[PDB]
Amino acid sequence: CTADTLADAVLITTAHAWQHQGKTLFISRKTYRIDGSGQMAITVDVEVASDTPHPARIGLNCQLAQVAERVNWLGLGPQENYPDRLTAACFDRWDLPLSDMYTPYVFPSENGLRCGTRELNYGPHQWRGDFQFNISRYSQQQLMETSHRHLLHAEEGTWLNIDGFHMGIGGDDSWSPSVSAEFQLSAGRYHYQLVWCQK
Amino acid sequence: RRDWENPGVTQLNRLAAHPPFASWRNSEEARTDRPSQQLRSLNGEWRFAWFPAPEAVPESWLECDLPEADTVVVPSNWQMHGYDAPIYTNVTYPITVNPPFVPTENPTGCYSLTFNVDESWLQEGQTRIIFDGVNSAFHLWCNGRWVGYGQDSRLPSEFDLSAFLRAGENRLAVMVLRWSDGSYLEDQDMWRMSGIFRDVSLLHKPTTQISDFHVATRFNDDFSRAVLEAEVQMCGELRDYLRVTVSLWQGETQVASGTAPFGGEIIDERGGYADRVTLRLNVENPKLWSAEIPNLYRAVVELHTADGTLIEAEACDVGFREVRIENGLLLLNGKPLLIRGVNRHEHHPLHGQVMDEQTMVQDILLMKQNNFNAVRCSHYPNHPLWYTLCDRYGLYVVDEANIETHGMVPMNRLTDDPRWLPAMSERVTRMVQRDRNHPSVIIWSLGNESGHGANHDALYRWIKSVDPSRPVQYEGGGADTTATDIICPMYARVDEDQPFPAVPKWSIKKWLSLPGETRPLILCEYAHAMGNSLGGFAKYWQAFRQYPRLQGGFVWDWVDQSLIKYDENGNPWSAYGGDFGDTPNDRQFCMNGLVFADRTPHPALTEAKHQQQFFQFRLSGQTIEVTSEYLFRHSDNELLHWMVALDGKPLASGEVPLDVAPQGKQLIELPELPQPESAGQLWLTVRVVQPNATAWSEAGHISAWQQWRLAENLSVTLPAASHAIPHLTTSEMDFCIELGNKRWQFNRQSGFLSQMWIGDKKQLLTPLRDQFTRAPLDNDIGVSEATRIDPNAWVERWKAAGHYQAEAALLQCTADTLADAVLITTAHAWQHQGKTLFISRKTYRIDGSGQMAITVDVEVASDTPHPARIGLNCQLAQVAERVNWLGLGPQENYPDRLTAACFDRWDLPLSDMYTPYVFPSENGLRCGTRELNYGPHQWRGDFQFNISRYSQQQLMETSHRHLLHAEEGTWLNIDGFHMGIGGDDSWSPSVSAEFQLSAGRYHYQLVWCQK
């Protein structure tokens, strides 16, 4: 974790590793560039082991402290789509309320993802690049533990998961692994860039 | 009478076709195939003269040879001796399209030969001459007297000289014509040569002869009891005391025998053939013939008297096998075949289409060592020794009649005309009569690419009527007509549909599921291996192995058809179409083979070998599942050799013997694999090694290999803090970074890495820039010329979009020194006519340890055609003898063709890095490279690299490999992403959408350091 100030920027370098029982699964090396114009740039480079099962997601996780009524995003939509199910979504400028961002599946799971997003606006924040995002009031952890949609409770602030790469969901059957090999995150090295600015 | 301009006459005084004859006078000589003194070879020194027209030949040549005539060898083609220029053409005819008339200016070759005949040959019996092949039509004279006329070029022509030969000196005069009416059925894809290109021989028979002999085999469901039916024919007088013995021998041991006096069963209302006899021989537990175990029997037929005096004995090689189709599956000995065939053309490296035994055996050895079990005699009947060697070595043979009418409009202009039915009838039935006794011949064929006419299907089921023991296939008409039992399309893709009008080439998986379709599918021509080609072979063979009714195919083709020319200093060099003054010509379309003209293997042959293995491997946990694809043999000459490597460094290895039943399954349990704590990747490589030397392989031959990816140790260590920090100096036009001995230089005007200094030695001759364009491949060009442009070709799309003409524009170039680094940022854009095609933003990080890091991020427009390459281009100033790289290899591989390459540490000379394609193009690429070492330089990361002495630009401009000149220094192209090469065909875009660079945003990282 090193920091250095540039001529018209401040450059932040970090590098992490996820280890389980002495085995390193993921290694990510980020480069935060803080420009003088106000935009801050995130470049993520992730090394993934293949002996471990392929990850369902390579992206970022954060919880905003502001709850906004409207969410603007320019990309595929306006309905929920995924890497294996996106032929119906249309690339346009979509404006939706935050409640419509979370689809109410009776069994809580990963939901609300929008693929092919080039620009995302939420409150005073703006994200640009090429990413897959979902936004809700409920954390991923709560979606794992809670088994009924009526037992879910809205958490403080707003949870946001921006994903550079996402794994397909399958659907040929519900008792065998149905995800095709072309939708599995199995390349090994992944890279995506983010631009964070206030509009 | 101009007999060469008339389809109604194809022969005059020509004897009937038959299986091949030696006329032995001893059964023991026939049994072991010793040479017979009754069969004389007339090959040798002949007198040759050339004339521009048959009418220009003086009639004094009929009496004695001309003093101006030269002496050539026979068999040979006079085109290779300078008398004419050989013409090659793929589709368009070399003459005007006006059948059945040929042009008046007809090249004519007059062959003369003087020799002696023993007086014992003239006193009794019949003496006949055999012309194994004459291209195209010829008139024959004996002692100044006209004998006969021949038209066919790939089948033997036999004439009688018993009333023509005289005691003492005899002269034979042969007038060969280049073009004839039969040449309209000879539009096959080869160098159109001419001459007596096959053997000429004299054969002597008694008065009462053995006319023809048919051999057929019949089995039961368990193949334990076989019936050998021998049909025997005679020419000559009918006497009561003539008897026939058909004897079957295995080695020196007699298996079965039978003697019957002449006279057949009653067939029709008033009797049967009195000159035909039938022998049924019973064999108990026969050894079945196959491509794996070529078990052969020697059947010796003899014509003798009731007292036992032998008149004549004839012998042939008999293989006990059956080929039949039920339930839409081609079955050989009850098992479904998986054809691993390859198209083969008779092309000698030095003598054109003059074929000898040495190159035949070399071809069979190279084919069998590369996991090919079949051959397609394309597109003509072959030299009869080829079939004998296919029996001896065990290759399936698809015999094809020499018929092709690719130059008419439409395709079925001649083949639907009943006037041309006699010609193709004598061109099919004679080949059927000749090669029906060869067990290697398993599938008959009518010809290639002549449309669908009534005459075609008529001949097809004529072969069904005469020879029901073999299936017979035909292409023309869309490969779905009634003229075929096997669906055989040309170059049909695995998945993508190409619906041409009225002849649609559906994908094979969709083709087999068509309504009302039941026949099996074997591709007669697929996977065009034209130069840098053969991509997607893995998809083809996965489709073949997954589907039961997909029974393989034939790769087009085996050998390049390139002729040897000489420069001003006499150095030989291979030449293609148009290099001999011939017009028109399809420019290099004669090099489509998996080997060179001198039988040097291409890098595609390794992929063809790997995709055709008879052993399949599956790794589950620590166990290896070995699956055999052999249909009749047990694994008795194979052992499994595994090895575990950590980044090219061997850790554990061993040998396990293989015991797998035919189409069986065996479990191999590997010992405890080592578990290292050091960073790297564990790769498990297994090889099947043959310990003993077979008749086609040497001791230690590798037949199959497969390599997986085991548990990985990701690197989490940190580099040590360098005590020295790089010094950054800013100039008015230049950025220079010093580390002491190491110095880098960046040009601010061009925005690229200008130079690098080790001590006082410069390292680059040209600055490190981008490269989004490669030298166009043969599949990439297609059928586009400079005169005629094909807009669907990849190269024409690129040059229309200005990929080869875009100029780099500098957008930003900033420098700043960090705490333990010097950081360089650049950003460029390629623009053509005001349209920005590519935008690349690099970040050069110069560390204090000496390693310099390159991070490339490229934005690519998609409205422009997808680039063939996203990578870096530079020319090193040092030429090194050895190049070290750790990755897939050691042969050339590509994104669509890399299943055969193995991930290991490879050391090769620099000359082996450049494969010598006759037409220069992109070559030498190695995929999956993790580390590359060249001289004092080391590159690390994930990239595809090729290294040579020749620039990409020189490969584009230069059209002959002998005109290429080594440039100063060493050219290197490191590519983060490369586009696949295709290979389904060479006239349409064959690159699959999964191998096209169409993502839009690409990123790759490089590490440059000095070792």
Side-chain angles (χ1 to χ4, degrees), chain A residues 4-7 13 17 19 23-27 29 45 47-51 118 130 165 189 191-193, chain B residues 681 709-716 812 815-819 823 825 845 857 930 942 977 1001 1003-1005:
Chain A
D4 160 356
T5 170
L6 319 174
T13 318
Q19 286 157 227
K23 260 39 73 163
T24 313
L25 314 169
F26 315 106
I27 289 171
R29 333 161 163 269
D45 168 71
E47 286 74 273
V48 179
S50 58
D51 65 61
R118 221 66 173 221
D130 200 348
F165 303 90
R189 319 145 307 101
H191 172 82
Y192 60 95
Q193 202 208 8
Chain B
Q681 239 280 14
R709 270 168 83 282
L710 311 203
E712 318 145 31
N713 278 335
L714 274 206
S715 163
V716 303
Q812 102 174 15
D816 160 356
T817 170
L818 319 174
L823 195 300
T825 318
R845 186 169 141 107
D857 168 71
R930 221 66 173 221
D942 200 348
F977 303 90
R1001 319 145 307 101
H1003 172 82
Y1004 60 95
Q1005 202 208 8

Side-chain angles (χ1 to χ4, degrees), chain B residues 6-8 100 414 416-424 455:
Chain B
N6 187 355
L414 296 176
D416 212 80
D417 200 327
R419 277 169 101 51
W420 291 79
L421 180 51
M424 28 169 41
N455 309 348

Side-chain angles (χ1 to χ4, degrees), chain B residues 658-690:
Chain B
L658 225 36
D659 180 286
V660 195
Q663 325 158 252
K665 218 126 185 181
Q666 200 202 350
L667 267 302
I668 268 53
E669 199 98 31
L670 286 193
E672 306 323 274
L673 326 167
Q675 298 109 304
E677 332 105 310
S678 33
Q681 239 280 14
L682 276 187
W683 295 74
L684 168 65
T685 312
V686 293
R687 297 194 257 101
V688 168
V689 189
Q690 300 179 4

Side-chain angles (χ1 to χ4, degrees), chain B residues 184-203:
Chain B
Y184 290 111
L185 311 178
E186 307 247 344
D187 202 353
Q188 295 113 11
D189 192 21
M190 93 270 302
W191 285 96
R192 305 276 155 82
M193 309 224 63
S194 34
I196 311 184
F197 70 101
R198 282 185 185 174
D199 287 340
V200 182
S201 179
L202 252 190
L203 207 144

Side-chain angles (χ1 to χ4, degrees), chain B residues 580-896:
Chain B
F580 294 93
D582 40 310
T583 281
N585 51 79
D586 296 285
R587 94 297 307 271
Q588 76 270 324
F589 278 58
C590 52
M591 296 88 95
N592 320 305
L594 295 161
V595 301
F596 281 109
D598 56 300
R599 267 71 188 168
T600 293
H602 284 227
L605 196 52
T606 288
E607 169 87 336
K609 160 150 184 177
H610 174 72
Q611 287 303 159
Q612 286 162 1
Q613 301 160 187
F614 297 91
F615 288 112
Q616 303 272 118
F617 307 94
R618 169 161 90 258
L619 180 65
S620 259
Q622 217 174 67
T623 37
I624 294 172
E625 200 94 22
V626 191
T627 303
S628 177
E629 300 223 313
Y630 288 118
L631 297 174
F632 316 101
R633 67 179 300 274
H634 190 93
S635 46
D636 36 38
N637 198 34
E638 300 83 358
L639 57 90
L640 175 79
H641 179 231
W642 85 114
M643 149 183 127
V644 171
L646 180 99
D647 228 20
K649 142 79 181 173
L651 280 58
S653 86
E655 326 203 46
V656 182
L658 225 36
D659 180 286
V660 195
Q663 325 158 252
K665 218 126 185 181
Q666 200 202 350
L667 267 302
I668 268 53
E669 199 98 31
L670 286 193
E672 306 323 274
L673 326 167
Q675 298 109 304
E677 332 105 310
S678 33
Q681 239 280 14
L682 276 187
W683 295 74
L684 168 65
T685 312
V686 293
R687 297 194 257 101
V688 168
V689 189
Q690 300 179 4
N692 274 21
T694 15
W696 53 271
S697 67
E698 54 96 23
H701 179 70
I702 301 143
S703 43
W705 64 93
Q706 172 74 303
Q707 158 178 9
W708 303 277
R709 270 168 83 282
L710 311 203
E712 318 145 31
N713 278 335
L714 274 206
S715 163
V716 303
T717 206
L718 278 164
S722 63
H723 34 285
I725 45 169
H727 199 327
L728 163 71
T729 58
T730 292
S731 285
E732 332 208 352
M733 83 207 96
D734 197 327
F735 277 117
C736 194
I737 297 128
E738 298 75 6
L739 179 129
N741 37 14
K742 299 175 75 175
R743 214 159 78 264
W744 302 263
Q745 186 187 48
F746 293 81
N747 198 264
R748 287 165 75 161
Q749 266 52 57
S750 82
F752 294 118
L753 181 273
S754 160
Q755 246 301 351
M756 278 168 0
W757 274 285
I758 282 308
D760 194 20
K761 267 182 109 163
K762 329 151 91 173
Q763 309 283 306
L764 318 99
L765 297 173
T766 38
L768 181 130
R769 53 188 320 81
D770 289 20
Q771 168 166 75
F772 307 107
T773 37
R774 76 189 177 195
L777 305 172
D778 271 350
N779 298 346
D780 247 14
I781 276 145
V783 286
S784 66
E785 305 112 28
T787 36
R788 205 195 301 116
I789 264 57
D790 205 37
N792 325 330
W794 272 107
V795 59
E796 309 271 39
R797 283 224 288 284
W798 291 324
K799 69 177 55 185
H803 281 207
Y804 286 113
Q805 266 169 255
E807 40 214 271
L810 181 274
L811 270 68
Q812 102 174 15
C813 173
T814 62
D816 160 356
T817 170
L818 319 174
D820 188 318
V822 168
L823 195 300
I824 298 290
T825 318
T826 198
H828 307 246
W830 278 244
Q831 286 157 227
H832 182 254
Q833 287 190 12
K835 260 39 73 163
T836 313
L837 314 169
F838 315 106
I839 289 171
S840 34
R841 333 161 163 269
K842 292 198 211 61
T843 310
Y844 301 83
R845 186 169 141 107
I846 293 263
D847 208 327
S849 178
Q851 324 215 120
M852 81 139 299
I854 287 100
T855 88
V856 182
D857 168 71
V858 172
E859 286 74 273
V860 179
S862 58
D863 65 61
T864 188
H866 305 136
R869 173 175 288 174
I870 296 142
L872 291 210
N873 184 283
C874 74
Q875 196 197 4
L876 275 274
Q878 144 87 345
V879 180
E881 328 83 320
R882 305 305 298 222
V883 39
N884 188 304
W885 87 90
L886 166 137
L888 306 178
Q891 290 257 324
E892 145 170 294
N893 39 323
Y894 278 94
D896 39 21

Side-chain angles (χ1 to χ4, degrees), chain B residues 450-521:
Chain B
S450 304
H452 189 233
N455 309 348
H456 261 305
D457 56 66
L459 301 152
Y460 142 87
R461 83 130 185 172
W462 186 90
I463 308 182
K464 232 61 182 64
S465 177
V466 153
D467 184 37
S469 73
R470 297 181 179 91
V472 46
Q473 87 186 54
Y474 179 45
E475 228 296 349
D480 42 22
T481 70
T482 69
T484 171
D485 311 312
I486 293 149
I487 300 166
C488 48
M490 269 107 74
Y491 314 105
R493 283 161 204 211
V494 179
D495 262 317
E496 163 141 77
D497 222 40
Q498 328 159 218
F500 311 122
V503 162
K505 257 154 45 179
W506 323 87
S507 73
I508 49 183
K509 320 214 273 231
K510 182 198 167 162
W511 207 321
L512 278 157
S513 146
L514 283 182
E517 205 101 65
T518 164
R519 293 167 296 198
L521 205 149

